[PDB]
Amino acid sequence: KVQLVQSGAELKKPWSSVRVSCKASGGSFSSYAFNWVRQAPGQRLEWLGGIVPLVSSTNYAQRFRGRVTISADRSTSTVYLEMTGLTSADTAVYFCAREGEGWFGRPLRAFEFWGQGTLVTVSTASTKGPSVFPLAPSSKGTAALGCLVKDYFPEPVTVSWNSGALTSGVHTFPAVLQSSGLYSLSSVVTVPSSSLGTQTYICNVNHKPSNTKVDKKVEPK
Amino acid sequence: EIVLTQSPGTFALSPGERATLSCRASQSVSGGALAWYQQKAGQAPRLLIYGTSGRATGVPGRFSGSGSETDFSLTISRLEPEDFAVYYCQQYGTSQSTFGQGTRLETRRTVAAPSVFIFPPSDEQLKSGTASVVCLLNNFYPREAKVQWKVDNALQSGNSQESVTEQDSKDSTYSLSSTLTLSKADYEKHKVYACEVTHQGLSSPVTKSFNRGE
């Protein structure tokens, strides 16, 4: 099976550069075209370019000509993307996609095999850990509680409940970009009103960019 | 440049029905060089159709691709629960390749009214100089809903941000979170804080309110 493993997520300042890798495993590497497709949050897919490693045949999109350089290391079966002149418009998830194998390995142009994606964030905002505030259940069926993860940068944060033991009825909302450069999301969960006195509800927030692990115990008002 | 435009924007169908998604090009697409991808939230796209009509390896037979020139279509003959996702078309021209904006296939279900909850800003947050009031709209359908904030019965504008979850893979519902941000002074200024929800499943708007410091 053909596997594509990309580099880790990155946070770059504007007008700097980013370098994303893509290691290929399994099938043949040198004779197929590896491409880079980026997807901005909530927007459509955008093809940047590609390369065929055997002849180092590169091919870029006109929107990124002179800004994007795609190379390949045949000895390690790795494909690299390097972009300069970064701005906030370049904040997106960058995928590395290889074209498909047809009859007897006939290349298929269409991108059949994909990597996991690499989040590249371009912003002047500094890395900050989140503040976790309890969304305490009402004094009043079913009761809803949760945690507010506010003022962190960059993405992502991971929210579990009771260290993963509580999964049913949980809703971790997509984060929004505040008026400042910081993110904020909320993670709620609906539980029986009778269990509020005998069941402990703890929200586990992890923001690895700041090495921040926070367990916040939510209790009624 | 070729611009791909997909239709419709969002489709609401039930499993076992036939789905037809259209993709129109701004000019003639070269010799049947059209692709169709499926994408589920949090994952990478999955190639469904290559070259207008070619079925990708492992893709089920219920997916079919058709069309020519400037009009193409992806047809799912009998919808199954795992087929509800976002679908993209792509043109592979020459030295350039573009995508469509995408069509989202959602599971259709009975109208569901939202369960509305309101959370005041915690004392631990108020000890930091800001106040975040939260309004939760849990499990509703369809996606369209309206949230209005009122501070001492005064409609707000600009100081509130909301976010909606993906469609739940079990009950096919949505959930909305609205956050109203105020200064600590502006929070201690007034008394009543309410969030009013308007939704198709509600004959009358549902207002969830609270008084400061009680």
Author numbering:
A (entry chain H): 1 to 52, 52A, 53 to 82, 82A, 82B, 82C, 83 to 100, 100A, ...
B (entry chain L): 1 to 27, 27A, 28 to 213
Describing publication, verbatim:
Notably, long heavy complementarity-determining region (CDR) H3 loops with aromatic residues at the tip facilitate bnAb binding to the hydrophobic MPER and nearby membrane. DNA sequencing revealed PGZL1 was from subclass IgG1, whereas most MPER bnAbs are IgG3s. Using X-ray crystallography and cryo-EM, we determined the orientation, angle of approach, and composition of the PGZL1-Env interaction.
We observed lipid-binding sites in both antibody structures. To determine whether the lipid-binding sites observed in our structures are biologically relevant, we mutated the H4K3 lipid-binding sites. However, the neutralization potency (IC50) against HxB2 and Du156.12 is reduced with all three mutants by 7–84-fold, with the H4K3_SFS28EPE and H4K3_5M exhibiting higher losses in potency. Hence, mutation of the lipid-binding sites influences binding to membrane-embedded Env on the virus but not binding to MPER out of the membrane context. Our model suggests that H4K3 contacts the membrane-MPER epitope in a similar manner to 4E106 with the MPER helix tilted 67°–73° from the bilayer surface.
